[PDB]
Structures are given as structure tokens and as C-alpha cells.
Amino acid sequence: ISPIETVPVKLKPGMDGPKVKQWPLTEEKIKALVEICTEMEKEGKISKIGPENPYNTPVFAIKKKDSTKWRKLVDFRELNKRTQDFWEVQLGIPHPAGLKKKKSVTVLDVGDAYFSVPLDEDFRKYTAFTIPSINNETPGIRYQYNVLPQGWKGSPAIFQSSMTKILEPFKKQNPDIVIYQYMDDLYVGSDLEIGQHRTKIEELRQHLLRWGLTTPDKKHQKEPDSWTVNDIQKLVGKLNWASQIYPGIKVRQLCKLLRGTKALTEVIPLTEEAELELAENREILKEPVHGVYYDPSKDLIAEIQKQGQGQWTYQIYQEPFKNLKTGKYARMRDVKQLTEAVQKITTESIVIWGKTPKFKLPIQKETWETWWTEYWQATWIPEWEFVNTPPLVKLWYQ
Amino acid sequence: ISPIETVPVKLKPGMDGPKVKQWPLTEEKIKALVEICTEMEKEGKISKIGPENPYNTPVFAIKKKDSTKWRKLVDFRELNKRTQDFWEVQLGIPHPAGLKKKKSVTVLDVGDAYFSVPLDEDFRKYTAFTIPSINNETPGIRYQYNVLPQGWKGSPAIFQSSMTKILEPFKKQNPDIVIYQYMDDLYVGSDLEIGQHRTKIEELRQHLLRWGLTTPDKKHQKEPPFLWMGYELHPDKWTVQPIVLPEKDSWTVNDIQKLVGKLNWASQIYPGIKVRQLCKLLRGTKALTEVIPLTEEAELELAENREILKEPVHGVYYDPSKDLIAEIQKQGQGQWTYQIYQEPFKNLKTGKYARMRGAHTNDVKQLTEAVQKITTESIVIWGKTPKFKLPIQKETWETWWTEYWQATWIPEWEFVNTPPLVKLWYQLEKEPIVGAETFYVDGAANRETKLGKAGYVTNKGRQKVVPLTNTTNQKTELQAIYLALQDSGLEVNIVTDSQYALGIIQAQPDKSESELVNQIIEQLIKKEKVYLAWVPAHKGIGGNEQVDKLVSAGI
Ligand SMILES: Cc1ccnc2c1NC(=O)c1cccnc1N2C1CC1
């Protein structure tokens, strides 16, 4: 028996519950989903069947780590827009601008807590959803959540008081270690404690279990000559173009070099306004030279990952040719490659900005909807968009 | 009535019960809408007089077609609108292609059902209507329902739902005789010796009848090869039925729209049907009655389709599980098609894939586009992706994803000797050929004056210009490449000031959709080594400033 012990969750003026879809899951994928949900229903509260409420929320069944069992990854993306973004004002868990500065960060899936511990009242009806049936032969019936849904940002907003007190005994015994709760996950980060963090983390993975049942099941240790003419079609062309994400900085007296015609001959290699501009530009290209590049916690963080070969270059920027961070993930031998990058980026946007970015993926809309859910482990869901036909590299890098 | 469990129904927040009145069809109306409304109780009490305090709704009697008695009608649209987003919608079509095979199935229809199941009580008050009582000075006869009313979306959602509650104990007391429902229609089927099937239908019809739902039949009443949504089906196989009647020209867009309709439905199993040219011309036609002139080829798409439409194309083994589920894309109808199958002859599902998408997304790239329709399709029809029998093979495929500017992933695919289509028609040398006559490209044209200019200028002091009138710069820059090719042999390196122009060539397209591009391709297929390269739109680049000049002045 709990019994009564809620928190008044509500939606922004002029809103209704999501009425999304549910992607037609592979059968085996539903078979499990159907299992995860039955134990959940008998595991009480966590779920109970609905029948006269329209709201629905995408639901996927997946596995995580080296895999053995499965797990539901429920896509509360519109309920967020619909509740959290609104109920993002107070309840809100603010973001520590040092978590990155604290160079070593282990993250713990402390989210199981959200379950039976606390709950929804009067609003359970919006966390509805459905588990399918191959070819819709049966009206694959729908459940309703009766506890905090391990998914929406609306939960930790609710669970920050319980979570705060629980983490209190540690925040002192082990003073300033920056702990950041984001959404079912904790970025306990710390200074380069000589490989150590292995310790304190398991220390906390344990403190959680002692002083509560909050469980980050396992230590979770994510512990971190020929200067051909054509060569200038290249050199210039991109050079001319790099400085665009810059002011009108010189390239031209290096430029003009190719006058007249004749493209397989070498130009110079050795000149004033050439070497003393190739280089002049050369020294100009180093990350920190920037300018009025600023985050405006008010304009969405757009991102554009560019497929490189075995490698993949990515670029998080807030508004046009003004990147706020532009690095490259890369693992040789690919849809399941983007998969690993789109995650790497968000898990990094977070540590850095308390919010995931909106992805512009170089993939066919639907070759993703079919298996992003293959090697997709993380519990949050970056909001993506399929931007194709196409990007422009042939440099950008070197 | 029905002893079943009522579903709570609240009126969209803020709103209220319908205030819609009407004005009589005299004796014709009332009289019909009474000798019946009186049976809304005394012959199965389906409503109760309760005339003053509630709201209202539209009474109206119709009935005519193929029968003998004046039917009532009240598909109340206001009530209909003061609650409606409310339920989760009936929404799905099981594709026969996957319905596994039962030995014997049956479709017991159900009696007036959406009226047997009950309707709340803290609601009904808004399902009232007034029948003027007596003649002209008709006092006012007012009812209100007690069951699902006809034409009120609560009905289908609640109904679909009340009946699968009822069909559960049964559907538990004897698995394996699993069933399906779509409106007054239960397509019950199992693999039982006809005999016992005969009685286990009685049980289903009996368990029904003790929950209202008095299933009208004589233990399976219905012509054995039922009419699904099209899909004339049978545990044997399935198909589609009447498919045509196109008299002769006066062919308006209204018609053509339906013909690609009739043809597409048919795609299901009839092999190689292929609507490109019959909806091709179907463009603009902003008006139905626009008797669009057909064309030369449309006649072939109707033609070649015509003959295809025999009957040596019907059904599948249904899902018959344990068999690989091969799916080969015998692609090449001057477009792309596929058939999902299980074993040897008889197919499982036939579906095309015309690609109304791209500046000639190649064979390789159109093929891939097609694997994720089959893959997406399969995943929904049988809950899995197919083995693929593909007319392509490594190399071609291999290198393209490996080097295509975007991402993609494909299930087990295996190749088969047939009409290749392996579009490795022309590839481009990445390093500017030396001992080659590099041509400088530039074309131009004015916005107002349609004055275009087909440029080019090589290192061998060569040059030429062919004028063009009625183009746009993004056209002159391609003729500006056609020439360069057309005026050279074997090698050839082209330098342009167009990202677009190359994007076409580089994407290495195919198929005539813009004749410049159509020929700028054929040249390539046969020109030992080539190498497009970009140079910043003018800005005085070497070789580009020069040609720039040629094509500029003349505007
Ligand atoms: C139209 C329809 C939709 C869904 N399932 C079925 C049917 N009807 C059949 O007649 C049918 C035919 C073949 C196999 N299953 C069938 N059945 C299944 C129930 C035995």
C-alpha cells in the first residue's frame, strides 16, 4: 500500500495528449515487448490496460550492452513537447557548467527508481501506448502507466527531491564530485583521479543501493613538392569557402596564381601572398580563433553529421556557419555506425548543455525508422530529421 | 440490451449535448418513424421515452434500394462533434498475403449489433430526438438511446471493443480456432475436420447469442470465397476481382485517376502491371472534366497491362511459415518491380516500385530504394524481412554504398543472373588526367532575355561557343559540358563553376528525363577516362575567368 502520494502534472494551455503512431515492430520484437509488459502489469501499477482514450505513444523493445534480455524504450517524444517543455519551468533540474571541466565522467542509469517509488494521478491516461500484432490480425491491446514512466523528462522533474535526499549522504562524504541528473541517467563526473573514479563510482553505485533501492545495475564504467595547378582548384576553392565561417579574409593573391589556363602543370611551389597566405591562413585555422559564437539557451541546437568513409565527421551549431563544437566520431567497419555517432554526440551535447540536439541525418527516411532500434542502446531519443541530397565535403577537413 | 460492461463517455471538455431540431415530412415521416420507434422498446427495448429535460438530435426516415420498410436515420453530427477525438480509431488492414491458411474458415455476420451493446447512462440523455407527436399539433414524442447509436464514432471503437471482450472466454476455452473481426463480420477459421468445424461454429454462435449479438446464420451463411476489401479470398488462396471497363477516348483526368486506381489495386498479384505512363501525363489537370489527351506510350501501359490481366495470376500460399520467404526483385520494367514468394511457382505478393524520386537515382540507387519497401512491407505483413534475390552483385553494389555520400543498410541479399542493370555504366577518375586537354566550362543566360551561351576553352588555345536561346544558367552549364565532351576524345578533364551541374554527373544518373543530361551520360559511357572538378563560381579562377568571359557578354 503506498497509498496516495502524487504530484499535479499538467499540460500547457492549448494541448492534448500525444496521438502518435507505433512503428510496426518485428514480431520477435513484439513477442518480448509483450513479455516485458505482462511482468510489468503483474508487477503492478507499472501498466494497466486502457480502452476509450485515444492518446498513444510510440514504443520500442530493444536490448542494451552485450545483450541477453530486452527492454522497452518508450518514445515519449510528443508528451515531452506536450508536458516537460511546459513543465520544464520549475521541477526543472538546472545544468552544472563544470561537469565538462571535470574531465572524467561516468554515467549511471539510475532510472528504475522512477517506477513504483512515486506516481501519476489523474494523468496516467496520457502515457498510453500499444503493443502490436503482426499484420493487425488482432487489435493488439494498449496499456496505461500508473507510475513514473521510465522515459519522459516529466519523471525526474518529479523525482528530484527523493533523488536529492538519497544522493545527499554522498555529496558530502565525497564532497564536490559534480553530480548531474539529466533524465534517468546520472553524470557523476570528477577530476583525473588517477584512473580512479572506478572506486567512487562503485562507491556510489553501492551508496544508492544501501540508502535506497535506486539501482544503477552494475558499476556502469564509461570511463574516458607537387603543387599542381588543379591542387589550387582545391586549395583555393575550399580555402575561399572555409573563410565564410569567418570574415572576408584573404586567399586571392594565392588565388590568381592559376591565370590563363593549363591544368596538370605544377604552380610555383614558393611565393609571396602564396606561402605567405597559404600559411597566413594555415595559422588562421585553429579551433579557438572564433568570435561571437554563443549559446542562447533559447534557440534550438541543430546538428549535421557528415559520413566520412570508415570515419564520420559531426558538427553541433546553434545558428548557421558558426559551429559551437565540430569534431569527428569514427569506427572502421554503417547504418549501425551513424547509430553510434548520433548517440556519441547527444551524450556529449548533454554533458555540455543540458539538452540533446536536433539531428539532420544523411540517411534515407525509413532505412532508419526500420532499425535505428538495432544497435541503439541509450534511453533518451534525440529528435532527428533526414537531410539528404546532399552535403559538401571534398575537404572541410584537410 | 446485453449484459455487458458499459464504456464511460465524456463530452469534449467544455462542450454540451446537441441542440439540433428539424421540421417533418408529415405523415410519411412520423408514421414510419414510430411504427418503428415503438419497437425501440416493445421488440427489444433499445431506447426509452424521456422527452423533457435533455437536449436533442435529427430524426429523419429514409430507406429505399432493395427491401420493404421505411428505415430511420439520425447520424447526429453535433453530438458526433462534442466528444469525437475521444476514442482510439479502428485502423488496420490484414494483408491476405500473410493470413496463414486455415483448413476451413467462416464469416458469421452479426445481427443489428452496434445497437445490442449498451451505452452508458450518465450520457444517453444527449441521444434524444423529438418525433413530433400528433399530426400538426404533434405534442412532442421524445426518446433517447440506450445502446450504441448508428453514426456516432463512439460506436465503432466501443463496439470493436465490446465484442473482443465477449470473444475472449471462448477464444480461451479453445485456442487454435483463432478469429478476426471487421464490423458486423467475424472471419472465423481453423484447421478442423469440416464436421467438428460445423459444431465449433455453433458454439461460437451460441456463446455469442448469450451476450446479445444473435449471429444470423445457419452455422456459416455466406458464399465460401468472400469479398474482403477487394481481396476475394479463400483458405485456398486469394485475389482481387472485377478490374476494368475503359470504353474509348474522351479520357478525362477523373477517369485516368481511377484507372491508375484499378491498375494499382491489381498490382497485388498480377505480374508486371506498371502505371508509369498512365499517370505520367496525369499532371496539372487542375479539373476533373479535363479530357487530357492520352499519349503514345500510355497506350502501352494500358496495353501491356491489358493482356497481363488474365487469370494465370491469383493468390499465394498465404503465410505458410518454415520457408525462407525469398523475395526477388525481377526489376526492369523500364522501372522496378518485385515479387515476394515462398516456394517455386505460385507467388505470395506482387508489388512494384516506380521511382518518382530523383535526377535519375540509378539502378543501384533505385534498387536500394526498393529493398526498403519490400523490407518495410515484409516487416508489416509477416513481421520480418525477406531473403533477397537481387539482379545486382557485389562490385556494383559493393562500391556504391561504400562510396555514396549518404547512409543505408540492407538485409541478406543474394544475386541472380538476369538483366544485370548493374549501373557501373560510367565512373569518374579522381585525379585530373595529365597529358589531357583540360576544357574550361561556362554557360550562361539572362533572366529576362532568354539569351543563353554554351561555352568552353582549353589550354590548347582552342575555344568555341554555341549560342542558345530559351534556357537558364543551370541548363547552359550542362550544354557547357556536353560540348566539351562532344569536342574531345578518349581522356578529357573538365573544370566548371557549378556545384549543381556536377552533382548530376557525379550522382551518375541514367534514363531520359532531361535530354541534355540524357546525352551528357551516353558520352560518358564511352570516353576512356573523364574527371569533372569544381572551381568557385567565377571569382577569377584560372581558366574559369577566361571562359567566364565567353559565355557572359551577349545578354
Ligand atoms: C478476410 C480475413 C481476414 C483475416 N483473417 C481471415 C480472413 N478470412 C478468410 O476467409 C481467411 C482466408 C484464409 C485464411 N485465413 C482467413 N481468415 C482467418 C481467420 C481465419
CSV table of C-alpha atoms and ligand atoms in Angstrom, one decimal, chain A residues 137, chain B residues 94 99-102 105 178-180 187-190 226 228 233-235 318, ligand 1:
chain,number,residue,atom,x,y,z
A,137,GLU,CA,-4.9,-9.5,-37.2
B,94,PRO,CA,-4.5,-7.5,-42.5
B,99,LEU,CA,-3.0,-14.5,-43.3
B,100,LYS,CA,-1.7,-18.1,-42.7
B,101,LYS,CA,-4.0,-20.8,-44.1
B,102,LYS,CA,-6.8,-22.4,-42.1
B,105,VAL,CA,-13.0,-20.6,-42.2
B,178,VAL,CA,-8.4,-18.1,-33.6
B,179,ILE,CA,-10.6,-15.4,-35.4
B,180,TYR,CA,-10.8,-11.8,-36.9
B,187,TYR,CA,-14.0,-14.3,-40.2
B,188,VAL,CA,-13.6,-17.4,-38.0
B,189,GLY,CA,-11.3,-20.2,-39.3
B,190,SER,CA,-9.3,-23.2,-38.1
B,226,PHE,CA,-15.7,-13.9,-49.6
B,228,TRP,CA,-12.7,-8.7,-48.4
B,233,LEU,CA,-10.2,-14.7,-50.6
B,234,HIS,CA,-10.4,-18.4,-49.7
B,235,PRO,CA,-8.3,-20.6,-47.4
B,318,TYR,CA,-0.7,-17.5,-47.5
C,1,LIG,C1,-10.8,-11.6,-44.5
C,1,LIG,C2,-10.0,-12.3,-43.4
C,1,LIG,C3,-9.2,-11.5,-42.6
C,1,LIG,C4,-8.5,-12.1,-41.6
C,1,LIG,N1,-8.4,-13.5,-41.4
C,1,LIG,C5,-9.2,-14.2,-42.2
C,1,LIG,C6,-10.0,-13.7,-43.2
C,1,LIG,N2,-10.9,-14.5,-43.9
C,1,LIG,C7,-10.7,-15.7,-44.6
C,1,LIG,O1,-11.6,-16.2,-45.2
C,1,LIG,C8,-9.4,-16.3,-44.4
C,1,LIG,C9,-8.9,-17.0,-45.5
C,1,LIG,C10,-7.7,-17.7,-45.4
C,1,LIG,C11,-7.0,-17.7,-44.2
C,1,LIG,N3,-7.5,-17.0,-43.1
C,1,LIG,C12,-8.6,-16.3,-43.3
C,1,LIG,N4,-9.1,-15.6,-42.1
C,1,LIG,C13,-8.5,-16.1,-40.9
C,1,LIG,C14,-9.4,-16.1,-39.7
C,1,LIG,C15,-9.0,-17.4,-40.4
